[PDB]
Design a binder for this molecule. Structure first.
Ligand SMILES: [Cl-]
Ligand SMILES: [Cl-]
Ligand SMILES: [Cl-]
Ligand SMILES: [Cl-]
Ligand SMILES: [Cl-]
Ligand SMILES: [Cl-]
Ligand SMILES: [Cl-]
Ligand SMILES: [Cl-]
Ligand SMILES: [Cl-]
Ligand SMILES: [Cl-]
Ligand SMILES: [Cl-]
Lengths: 181, 182, 178, 184, 183, 182, 180, 182, 180, 185, 180
């Protein structure tokens, strides 16, 4: 359940490896950000490996991890394992250019954000105003790292868009579809 | 528990051309009220119909359904507020025939903007958000039509929960007479 | 439901206000009182009260109907007439408000709830005080008491015996035998 | 909870006036009653028109199609009256009325949208159920295009998302014929 | 709420017209009511035809066989009318109608599939319950092949998974006779 | 539940001297069947009684209660199996008048030993277990009486769940005729 | 579970206080305990406070606010992800010139929400204190944001979301970081 | 409770043993992949032993463990203990050719993946295409390591296919069926 | 729970594996991990297995049985309290002559139980697999008790409770020890 | 649970186990019986001659769990001193009487209860008969064990354990369950 | 809610046993285990017992009482907050002249409560036992408070709350503290 060799996630963290597993929420985001700032505080040069196997989660939690990645001076090497869907695909695409990897049988999914709203009509319009702001804010972030136009981003993320590692490499999400070290 | 006079107490009133809108208003309550308003119209298209309101409100689409049926039928409608007429219950009180909108002394009228919910993708949130804004402006135009107020007064008053006494509701234009028969 | 005993009493112009009082109970009571007024606006109406209380707006709805109809209303407290049940007992026609010897009457300020933003809570707190002032003026009107004593008595739960409620002005006669 | 007006409830009284009420969510229970009422009204007369009052937020697609088939099958002219709202399959029943007899109230609301559903099981069972919900999608689109007199391209474009319409917009689109303010 | 006529609920009013409604899922409660109606209609007249309206997603297999047996037993010609959908045992009752008297509305759909069930207990009880379910599967396949005029090899390959059909496809398969638009 | 007028569909069949044993069999169902059988005997002790069976079984004491009343009344009883007659349902099917036990072609009959529970002290377990073995032997003698089988064949066939086709139940002695047509 | 001390304690050794998730009496007690521990180390060394909170109890937020102002150390507030409700107050409560935010973060300000139950006298008592908290928060916001009381009233009447630049113009934060 | 020697699973990890026990989800997949990288960092030449006793689980979690196995340079010795079903059988076949073992009374099961889909018809078609892609993706992986044609994999995995260790060896899933170490 | 470092780990030093409580994939994985660890420490030293299990998952018990037969170490099985269902199979799987039981213990054997749900095709596959497990368990009991299959089939058709003396006569254990 | 204190931390029950003290408190199930049996075997491995102290404060529990502890108590060569604290009911009374003769003690206000075992049975009639014979064997098995250690005849045991039989420490000594009734020094 | 060596283990090092919260078999077994450990350390050093219990199981309170009276160490009972039901019995069970209580503490005594269900034979047995427990508690209270059995019967017939001075006069205490 938690092997000791020092839990198994710290021994990799000692090798400068940050694991992003399971759904992404404020708990997972705060742990990843705390590890990114600590590894930067130890060195501003050594690269940071980030293993991603997340089906998605909260949008604010994904942007919190994204900003911390795009703020630390260290180059981040993203490694997609199993799957990187929803905000997990953004963290995979937000890696250092040329250092974004994925395994052969992985799968990447992108889609527009979903949310909720309840209250008076004035409160619904305010909350719907921010959901559409996050939608276009995510579209600008994806178009920045994938080198795609906003038209292609809006057309592809209107629905759930699953991609194979080769389909994500050509789209601009990752860079290398590894088959061996 | 509904008493028997054979009918129930509400049907004995329905024979006297009396429709009771008591309690929360949803699809079930609106469907029953509309069915009664059309059955009373079939008996006579001239005899006035009396509507008693003791409703805290409910679904906006259900309240608009009753309002449309009230304005659709050519029968005169006398509205009677008992206890309280809040949310859509206040709209049904003001939707009566001009000059036939009454209220008891210790009644209470509350008006407020509609509330709702929305969940789904960002595209679905926007579609449902405007639709609530369309219902909000649709209610504000109906209130301004029967209360003879401007849209600025309706918007400023119904931004929050606006409770009114029968005198304040008469001064605002919702009801016409504050009855007192001691 | 014995064959309907409440429907039989209504034939003799008797409206029973038993159990708690909510929007459903008030709707039935108001519908019966107006039905009895449509038959005759002169014949007296008997109201049997055995209620532990309930929603305030439901009690005010019954009260306004009681004062609107021209029929004399004889109130008969049986067992207990607490909270809004005490108001309906005192709202009867003066000289026609009765209570059984071992019954009891309770009066107290209205209670409620409020939740939301600081603006909505202020609006709801405004209205719960208007109901408190409105109830005190109605109790002071029918019990022939001043607003000072009504505020001092209804600040907490105030239970009264049929003799204490008669002296306080809630009811008129404490029946021993007919 | 229904008033009693020999005695019957208010819905059974309207049924004697040849009025069927489709009010509330439409499932198999509601559809069967509506189909049973439509069959009984036809067995009383094949010429007298049938009035259908609609106040439904929608429901099961197979339930709405069941009512639609019975509406087109029976020989009686069907006057559809939208009261309150006619959303999802309720809008299809409104547009399924006799041409020229589809009415609505001025503040009513009409919504059309593509069908939804679910699928669970093996990959083979997923593909079978998925192809079925796509056949129902194309089946609804051809029915809407038939009664709204629109092209398939317009129907496919408008029903991709939830499409809310006003009585004036639903009249322009071809769902209803006239928006009534008073009895004609 | 079921509406009331005054010639009496709407299903009781149709029962006097010799119309039995098989609506919703089919279980022992629904099957027993349909059987009680069919045997009452035969006692009233063994010559007058019985009409059966079907709008069922299916249900218990034993309940569907109970209705099918009563259908084939009574001497009355049975006109089956599919409204909405006739799936699982509902498609079997639709095919169980008198030949030439099996109809369906245009936008209906018919689904057929092999039966499903459960089994739990000791290994001896599992083998008893499994053999009985397999006997029901072969029993249904023979009934379908009898009324659809198809071969067992066709029935075995079609009902292996869920097989949805349009009224035109169901007519060609042999489940119903006529697809009706206007009478 | 349908209604006739001249009355539910089961009450209308009872006027034709038909008793329906549908669904599970518990103390409630057994009491109704026995109340109808004794009522049908009070009308006529010589006219036959028809019993339609579509039951998966239930409580054994409830099945024995119906069996006792069936054998006690003087009326001949024609048992008709529709759908399935399992557990005590097969016992009521075999308890019909000899030569008047029928079944539809696709019906299914099952027989099995009784099941139950027992909880308490060791003394209570022994008493409750002894009564279950008495019910088991009491059922086996009743089955062997009406099927004309030996106790051994009844004991070995009912050790596990024994499902039979209508032809297999006719050969075993549970029913007499497998009707493909009236 | 949490990666090994632990990880938050490591950042505390670097004088970093993390205000993550909702804010209640338990979270406020931990933050105040960490702030008092960092002040016991030194009375002038800067304390860093990273915020990623959707809000929470108002009384718990005021507990953190008073502790932030009372301690002598300069507080460096960093908005990560979001800082809504009381989270924006703690973000704006930082030392002037030391209130930062990430580029894609978001700030929300709104009047306090609560509840009241009981009799009319108890409803009126609890309704007063909520109004007092509303003016108390409005005075706290107007102080650090250097805005007028009318602006704070019109802004926090409904929910108001702001980008890091919009909150910098309003007066919540001071510096908006960007691509290094 | 896990014993203490560290825990019993950590002492085996010192002997280069990775345990894939119980159902497979994202939590189990991450721990296995993390343990496989610990053994690779210690040595790229030393073989890794992976004991499997899993009924299966999430397919994406099984593909994650599969990719790490094929990625690392270390030879992997898969040992089927108890059962290797669903993705557990794929991990058993994913071992290095010639190093896939099984105990005599183990049980191997292969079957096509299962999933769910809900939403609008457009969302159903998108998710249905993905389930069919996972189906053919697993079929090509099984065909690659079992050295079978795609025709055989489709027929064998259309339903739940249970295999004895001797049958799974002939099918190509494992290599050796051991009783005692030879 | 008790420390001496649990009490079971202290026994694991003395090459003692405890199989107590219901057996599932969790218990089976722990037992196999202990058996593999004790084999790595020594291939000749015997392994003692104390059994107090009411049974459980059949595949979990088969995983323990195969691991017992795989390792080269002799395995002494000690029945304490009860050894029922798969617990009796592990008791009989010990090294011939090293299968013991306390005097007031209790041994029970029975055919496996399971479930099946789905289409008629799926029922037949799962039913065929349950019957394979039944014959597989029957061959294992006749493998260690040296009884004929006719005796194994007739005894395990129902729940067969045995005393330690009866289980020794049947061949499940070898010694009934009152004192060492 | 508190802890005490070459520098190991000991929970309060391990500190007593180091003094060769096994605590049997609360209900007795497979989990409790497994821990007690594990502790008795550990204390025997340290020394097969030093006495083992067993404190009992149990309301009872599973019969097979109590027999598992009883057999292990009789198997190990170490003399076992049983100390009844609070109450020793159901199987707890059997463990109190299972101690070495002359070393069975009890506190003044303790309470000892004995009764026949209870159980359940569900399934077919054949399964009910099998499970009924098995609880009957356990009943006779417990009666023979009580009659052995209390030195009472089997008939006295059958008459006393038909219902719940509560005893004071003085009554349990006269009956033969314990030897010494401690008297507050 | 455990401040770290935890705070209760640190007090046990000073020979202080805490009896907090309700008293059940779990609490009684811990208190008895601590009293036995503190006796093995020293038979002469006094043992301090801090009591803040609302009461609980009677057999659990009798177990602690029998352990307080069996060890040779003088027991100093210190009532804090409340000592109700069996907590008051353990308070009066201290060494004569070493029973203390804080000024605003509260002592409550009451007859035992219990349940009963089953046949009429089982009802009489369980009721005859709860009366023996009732009379047993009455003898223990009358022994340490030096009151008569008739006074204990009348006092514990209902819930009898006492102030620290009323408990001292009744015989439950010895000294009502104000300062050490
Ligand atoms: Cl970077
Ligand atoms: Cl009008
Ligand atoms: Cl009056
Ligand atoms: Cl038509
Ligand atoms: Cl026929
Ligand atoms: Cl007879
Ligand atoms: Cl500061
Ligand atoms: Cl490899
Ligand atoms: Cl071996
Ligand atoms: Cl010994
Ligand atoms: Cl002492």
């Amino acid at each position: 359940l938690i092997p000791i060799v020092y839990d198994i996630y710290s021994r990799l963290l000692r090798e400068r490896i940050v694991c992003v597993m399971g759904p992404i929420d404020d708990s997972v985001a705060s742990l990843v950000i705390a590890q990114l700032l600590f590894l930067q505080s130890e060195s501003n040069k050594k690269p940071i490996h980030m293993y991603i196997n997340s089906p998605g989660g909260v949008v604010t939690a994904g942007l919190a991890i994204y900003d911390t990645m795009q703020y630390i001076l260290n180059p981040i090497c993203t490694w997609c394992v199993g799957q990187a869907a929803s905000m997990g695909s953004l963290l995979l695409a937000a890696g250092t250019p040329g250092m974004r990897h994925s395994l052969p049988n992985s799968r990447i999914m992108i889609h527009q954000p979903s949310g909720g709203a309840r209250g008076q009509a004035t409160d619904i319009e305010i909350q719907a105003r921010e959901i559409m702001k996050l939608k276009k804010q995510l579209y600008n972030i994806y178009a920045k790292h994938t080198k795609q136009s906003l038209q292609v981003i809006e057309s592809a993320m209107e629905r759930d868009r699953y991609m194979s590692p080769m389909e994500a490499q050509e789209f601009g999400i990752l860079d290398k579809v590894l088959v061996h070290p």
